[PDB]
Design a protein around this nucleic acid. Structure first.
Ligand SMILES: [K+]
Ligand SMILES: [K+]
Ligand SMILES: [K+]
Ligand SMILES: [K+]
Ligand SMILES: [Mg+2]
Ligand SMILES: [Mg+2]
Ligand SMILES: [Mg+2]
Ligand SMILES: [Mg+2]
Ligand SMILES: [Mg+2]
Ligand SMILES: [Mg+2]
Ligand SMILES: [Mg+2]
Ligand SMILES: [Mg+2]
Ligand SMILES: [Mg+2]
Ligand SMILES: [Mg+2]
Ligand SMILES: [Mg+2]
Ligand SMILES: [Mg+2]
Ligand SMILES: [Mg+2]
Ligand SMILES: [Mg+2]
Ligand SMILES: [Mg+2]
Ligand SMILES: [Mg+2]
Ligand SMILES: [Mg+2]
Ligand SMILES: [Mg+2]
Ligand SMILES: [Mg+2]
Ligand SMILES: [Mg+2]
Ligand SMILES: [Mg+2]
Ligand SMILES: [Mg+2]
Ligand SMILES: [Mg+2]
Ligand SMILES: [Mg+2]
Ligand SMILES: [Mg+2]
Ligand SMILES: [Mg+2]
Ligand SMILES: [Mg+2]
Ligand SMILES: [Mg+2]
Ligand SMILES: [Mg+2]
Ligand SMILES: [Mg+2]
Lengths: 263, 186, 183
RNA sequence: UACCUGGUUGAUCCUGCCAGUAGUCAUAUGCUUGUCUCAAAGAUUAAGCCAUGCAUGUGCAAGUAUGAACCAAUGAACUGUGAAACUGCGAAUGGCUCAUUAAAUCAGUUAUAGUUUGUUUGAUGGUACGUACUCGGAUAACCGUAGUAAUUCUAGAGCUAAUACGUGCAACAAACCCCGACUGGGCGCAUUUAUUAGAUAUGAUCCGAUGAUUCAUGAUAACUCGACGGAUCGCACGGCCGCCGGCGACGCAUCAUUCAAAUUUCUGCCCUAUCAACUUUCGAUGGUAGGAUAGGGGCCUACCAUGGUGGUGACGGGUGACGGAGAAUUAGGGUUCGAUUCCGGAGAGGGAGCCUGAGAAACGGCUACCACAUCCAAGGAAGGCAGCAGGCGCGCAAAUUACCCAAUCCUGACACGGGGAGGUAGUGACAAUAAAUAACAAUACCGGG
RNA sequence: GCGGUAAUUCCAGCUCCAAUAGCGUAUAUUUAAGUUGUUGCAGUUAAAAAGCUCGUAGUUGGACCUUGGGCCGGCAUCGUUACUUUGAAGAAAUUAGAGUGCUCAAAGCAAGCCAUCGCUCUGGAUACAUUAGCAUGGGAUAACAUCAUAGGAU
RNA sequence: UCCGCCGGCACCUUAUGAGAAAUCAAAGUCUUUGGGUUCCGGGGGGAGUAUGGUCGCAAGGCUGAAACUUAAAGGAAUUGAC
RNA sequence: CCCGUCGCUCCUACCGAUUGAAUGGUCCGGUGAAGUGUUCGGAUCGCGGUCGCGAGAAGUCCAUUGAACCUUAUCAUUUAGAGGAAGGAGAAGUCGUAACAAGGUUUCCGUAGGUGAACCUGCGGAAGGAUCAUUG
């Protein structure tokens, strides 16, 4: 009340952190970092609860202190560091370069990308204005800021950003006909192609997207993330990429029963 | 202490509002600086929210005043306070606040005018070949020029002395000046 | 805070509105008598579960046929019924499940199936044998007479390996008698 | 399970209530109680009062070791660990309670183009010049003289450090703006003020952003007695003839981000008219100019105007009223409840004022008054369980002065310390789940096909 | 309502009944209660039409205006709402609900399988969530002023 | 005198209507429940009482409780008795 | 069947002389701690050149926030009270018979007066009347 809060109750944790209700009174509060602490997956919830590498809040530390975790091309030790979207969690030694992608149910998935594809990432772009001494800068959506950007780059764009030599390799503008993945709300994790953008003077830029399998859905100007030019994404999607409503999930379970086992 | 809450005020319906909490620090107030025009300058540092610093000027004698028409800013000493829009006892007490009319000596401005326009009021070839160019458009208001002989120019304070610790301002000209002259003449 | 407070919990029987009625009392006593129960609670909880299922089915049947929030849970309810041996293969509609009754549920209890499988001399002997750890479903010992068996496990009920009735060593009574006869 | 039954009569049909019927994560109580699992537990009355013990400290290779410390060594500064102490950081989170509070808190939904933000992540630091191979004075631990009945009460003396404190080279530029020698001053970044560019949308002709800005930003003139612009630490040793050099730690400033707060838009709350007018000279509603604030604003001051709300219930009163998510019962509609573990607010006996700090009007911080209450050598000194456990009291009404950081997480200089947060055992018929107290045969007796 | 010398009702024995490791009692309140009635009560005689009329606010207000028509990146500047459809944003927990043989259950979000130096990318679904706010389509039914000094449209 | 129309005070017969019934052509068109609107009742007493407010010269009028007590009070019709 | 006065007992509430009593709250007024900012002040300390600069405690002045106490008034809650008086209950009663039959004077409303009590009477009204009716 008189200041900041350093505790996060388990029942107050974000939903995509599927945490057992009777597992404790507290959840790991995400540290300050590049991502918004509600759309992030802390490292504690990576070496635990997603991989069986660590078993407690004592071996996550025991393997972070060995400097074994390299997120976004940099060794990180803070166990509650907020890896939030498409961050390259590159585990050295064993080589587990993982892109944090959005499951069709709003979850977080560690898509195992190849090593040479793990040397870059992509970032969404916030406003672009003039800095001190009249030097334009980028100010992406994951805390990153890049000075001297190419003048074609504008707001809401996406940039393919290198890691070892941090410079913009190329970029995709925000326009209709581009692959887009939704990263917020109920439509999280659904890829599609923008059909038209509707503009309301004052607020609420609404984007209408067409799914590959024929479905259509709308969302805000936020929560969307351009992925690739035209209809070809620049990254490997985890699987499915379609909403897959409950009935067809039941059908998949049925055919899994009727095949494979089939007995 | 002094607070800025609406807690003690009354509703727009004229009904008394009760109290459900104590006073809070983040809504405090402080005593006014009550800056004075005096020769013994004194400015005291204040520590404000966030750890930043406010400069509370208790006494000032000089200032940074700008002639907008010629766009020249000079440091000069204030001589008197002649008008105060809000309170008529703030000129009797000679209190430096924003929008308070003051008088500043014209010596720096006379010196700049002489060395720039080549004209005194109140070298081989380049300087003379450039001086008449500035003398071609040289024009001054009669009310502006009549104060150089007197040695003091009417001016207005645009800074907040109790906040920035300084008294800067601009020289009164045009439609402003006579409006105050008709208020200062008697 | 106490984290244990977050565990959900509920009640399973309801008790009747009118406590003293002759016809209802005789009906309940009749059912208890040949289904080998212990009290009216063992039957009231079955009534409660059946009432919940019937209410769900009735709510589903009120919706339009082309409503997915009818198709999905209609399929789920019929799947559960066909899984627990309640609805026959000739009753694959949401209307038949509204016609279910308490004896359908009581016929699927482990005690009832043990009695009807010829392993027990009477439905009370079945309950006694169940509570004495003599019966295993599949490979798992069960000592709960209310265990509702499924169709796929109906062919695996058998006396346990540890049981003297399923190939175990003699109980303490027989061993005591052998000790007495030894000397 | 969308349900009724008894009672007015000599008897009848009604209105109508009394009584009966079932539930309550709803509290007492009474009798009884074998097993398994799961669990509330001094809220109601007194936010009444507290003996006692604990609940917040913290050290990495990497700020400061000479313990007259330990473990090893054998002319060198130290060159292993390290108690104490200085320095830094934290103690504004968590925990507890519901007294005040009825468009007020609060919920959904807005805004900051009206602001502050330690920290985390990314980027960015040319102007000091008017000993830099590295400046100065103290001080703690230590040691020894003490005072007092007394306390992490207190005074002198002698030593010695810094990433403490205080000074000071800031090391080496360019461009530009002004005053100017006939054919020199300014200028890093920060602060304040003023002027000015930021276009339309000499042939060939650069220039961002919003729904919206004199906006982002640039140039100019000046201004400020400017806690700013590294006198800091660890590891590895190398390459060029003394020169140069890596990987890290901590620290200062600006911007963006994250963590947030503050203020704010619209709509929404229980009973009362035996509450119909309320507010305003002294702020009530609005305007102008200031002051103050991190910032908008009658938030405050001077002057001015007479406005603002109300049968669509203002104003006033009651609440055994914290608000919500939610709980019980539910054919549907509904009625009643919501102290309590999740979110928000408020409080630390009652009011008030404030220091430090990025963050407090903080009470396991201070200062004062009021009420209690504690030693005392009677000169003075120290207080805050609505934290955990426990005690008294109040009551119809509520458990151990136990164990532990093993789990969940948080905090610190930190892999390592600590955590009455939290977990574990104890009491527990609040509530709830499953479930023993006999099954079979023969014989005796008695029935039906 | 019972007990005034024959007590089916009190005090006890026997027998029997209901629930059963649970039952009784007191308060509070949900149902019962269509005895608070919007759904959905009543007002001649049972309690309940004002002595009567006028009257502002409130509530409620006649009819009338697209049908035949089959087919089946631009660029404006505009009557406003209620209603209805579709979408978005929407804390978890609780509730409903899919999967899952904790031995069953109340639960939990786990797990399952060849009999592996492992795999199923294992799963950790989905609804509802009044009203108010934002956006898309519809214009039937309704409310406002707009309606003949042309100061109208082109 | 006869016929017809509108408006009014009533009356007679009959439900196929309603109602506890008396009875009602409206007191009908009501579990097959909804045309608009005003007032007003919640078992019988205490009680139209206490007190406050307000109008009146007064008598009084309008508004109007609570503690407590009680298992009935009451409506229509029926058979007796008187 | 049934009504009221009077007599006895208990219970609840009301009026009530006492400028009642107590408790909590608010407005006004007086005193006003303590902190915060400001004015003056200068115990002392450091350095500089037998001369200046800097830091600075106690104290003091004004303003501000303002606890707390002391009177008046007012609001809200509980209660004492001599006396009066009202309801209800009680198996003890006294006095009559007002109502139910044409209740022996038909009954009942509004209003006014009167008397031991139910009640009586004057004026206007009603049938809930003991008359649905005199074209005679
Ligand atoms: K601190
Ligand atoms: K809100
Ligand atoms: K302000
Ligand atoms: K701090
Ligand atoms: Mg906006
Ligand atoms: Mg009852
Ligand atoms: Mg056992
Ligand atoms: Mg310390
Ligand atoms: Mg807290
Ligand atoms: Mg109130
Ligand atoms: Mg509001
Ligand atoms: Mg600008
Ligand atoms: Mg202002
Ligand atoms: Mg004023
Ligand atoms: Mg309260
Ligand atoms: Mg609450
Ligand atoms: Mg509690
Ligand atoms: Mg809370
Ligand atoms: Mg507080
Ligand atoms: Mg206390
Ligand atoms: Mg305090
Ligand atoms: Mg304490
Ligand atoms: Mg505290
Ligand atoms: Mg208890
Ligand atoms: Mg007898
Ligand atoms: Mg009724
Ligand atoms: Mg009557
Ligand atoms: Mg009547
Ligand atoms: Mg009438
Ligand atoms: Mg119409
Ligand atoms: Mg009544
Ligand atoms: Mg007669
Ligand atoms: Mg008589
Ligand atoms: Mg008579």
């Amino acid at each position: 009340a008189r200041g900041l809060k350093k505790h996060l109750k388990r029942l107050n944790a974000p939903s995509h952190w599927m945490l057992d209700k009777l597992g404790g009174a507290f959840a790991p509060k995400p540290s300050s970092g590049p991502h918004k602490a509600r759309e992030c997956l802390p490292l504690i919830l990576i070496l635990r609860n997603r991989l069986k590498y660590a078993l407690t809040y004592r071996e996550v530390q025991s393997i972070l202190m060995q400097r074994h975790i390299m997120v976004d091309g940099k060794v990180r030790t803070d166990k509650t560091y907020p890896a939030g979207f498409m961050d390259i969690i590159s585990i050295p030694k064993t080589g587990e370069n993982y892109r944090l992608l959005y499951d069709t149910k709003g979850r977080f998935r560690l898509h195992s990308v190849r090593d040479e594809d793990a040397k870059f990432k992509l970032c969404k772009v916030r406003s672009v204005q003039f800095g001190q001494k009249g030097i334009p800068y980028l100010n992406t959506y994951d805390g990153r800021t890049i000075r001297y950007p190419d003048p074609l780059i504008k707001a809401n764009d996406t940039i393919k950003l290198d890691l070892e030599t941090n410079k913009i390799v190329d970029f995709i503008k925000f326009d209709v006909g581009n692959v887009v993945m939704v990263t917020g709300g109920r439509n999280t994790g659904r890829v599609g192609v923008i059909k038209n953008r509707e503009k309301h003077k004052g607020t609420f830029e609404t984007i209408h997207v067409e799914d590959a399998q024929g479905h259509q859905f709308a969302t805000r100007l936020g929560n969307v993330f351009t992925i690739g030019k035209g209809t070809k994404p620049w990254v490997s999607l985890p699987k499915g990429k379609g909403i897959k409503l409950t009935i067809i999930e039941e059908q998949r379970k049925r055919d899994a029963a009727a095949q494979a086992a089939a007995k | 202490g002094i607070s800025r809450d609406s807690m003690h005020k009354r509703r727009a319906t004229g009904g008394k509002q009760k109290a459900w909490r104590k006073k809070r620090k983040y809504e405090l107030g402080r005593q006014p600086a009550n800056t004075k025009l005096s020769s013994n300058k004194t400015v005291r540092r204040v520590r404000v929210r966030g750890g930043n610093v406010k400069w509370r000027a208790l006494r000032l004698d000089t200032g940074n005043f700008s002639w907008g028409s010629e766009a020249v800013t000079r440091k000069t000493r204030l001589l008197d306070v002649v008008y105060n829009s809000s309170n008529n006892e703030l000129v009797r007490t000679q209190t430096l606040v924003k929008n308070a009319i003051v008088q500043v000596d014209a010596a720096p401005f006379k010196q700049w005018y002489l060395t720039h326009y080549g004209v005194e009021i109140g070298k081989s070839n380049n300087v003379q070949r450039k001086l008449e160019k500035r003398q071609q458009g040289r024009t001054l208001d009669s009310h502006i020029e009549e104060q150089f002989s007197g040695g003091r120019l009417l001016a207005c304070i645009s800074s907040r002395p109790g906040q920035c610790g300084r008294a800067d301002g601009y020289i009164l000209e045009g439609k402003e000046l006579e409006f105050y002259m008709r208020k200062l003449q008697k | 805070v106490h984290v244990n407070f977050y565990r959900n919990y509920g009640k399973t029987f309801k008790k009747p509105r009118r406590p003293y009625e002759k016809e209802r009392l005789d009906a309940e006593l009749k059912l208890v008598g040949e289904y080998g129960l212990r009290c009216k609670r063992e039957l009231w909880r079955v009534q409660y579960a059946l009432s919940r299922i019937r209410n769900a089915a009735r709510h589903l049947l009120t919706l339009d046929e082309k409503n997915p929030r009818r198709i999905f849970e209609g399929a789920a309810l019929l799947r559960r019924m066909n899984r627990y041996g309640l609805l026959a293969e000739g009753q694959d509609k949401l209307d038949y499940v509204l016609a279910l009754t308490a004896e359908n549920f009581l016929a699927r209890r482990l005690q009832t199936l043990v009695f009807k499988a010829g392993m027990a001399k009477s439905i009370h002997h079945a309950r006694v044998l169940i509570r004495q750890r003599h019966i295993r479903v599949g490979r798992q010992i069960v000592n709960v007479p209310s265990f509702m068996v499924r169709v796929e496990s109906e062919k695996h009920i058998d006396f346990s390996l540890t049981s003297p009735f399923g190939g175990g060593p003699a109980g303490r009574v027989k061993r005591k008698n052998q000790k007495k006869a030894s000397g």
